[PDB]
Amino acid sequence: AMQIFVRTHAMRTDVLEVEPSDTIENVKAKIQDKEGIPPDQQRLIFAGKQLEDGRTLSDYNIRQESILHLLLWPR
Amino acid sequence: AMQIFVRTHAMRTDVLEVEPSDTIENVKAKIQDKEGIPPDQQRLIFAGKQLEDGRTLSDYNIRQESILHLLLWPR
């Protein structure tokens, strides 16, 4: 049995075309199309808040050109 | 149609117990268990080289406590 370390890196910006009525999951689903990360392994953040899958972008005042942050969440 | 930005972040270290005979894919499969990233969306790097899925850790002189780097690769 061999022990190694893996340092994970991601530091990129992606643009999404979405609707205010979209849930955080529908956003997580668009993200999954780009980066392949399962939505249940994405933690989305905006303006100091962690975003909840069942709630909509409109519920967080996410608007045109808002910057969301995506943290990869291990399993 | 609304436009937003998603900034992706990952900056963590993971430990893997592997075998020198393991392919980069078998490593990518252990990684996928932890972080959920599909292996075909992982770019593994070691010591300035990009690692090839069909080749083994032994082929790159990956040994005990080697530090591999994982770059998330979009789709």
Binding site: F46, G48, H69 | H9, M11, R12
Partner: peptide, 19 residues
């Protein structure tokens, strides 16, 4: 885990001014 919580804290911090 400790790493994930520290990263979460870092990114929440960052989002306070990068939104």
């Amino acid at each position: 885990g400790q790493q994930e919580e520290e990263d979460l804290q870092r990114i929440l911090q960052l989002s306070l001014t990068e939104h």
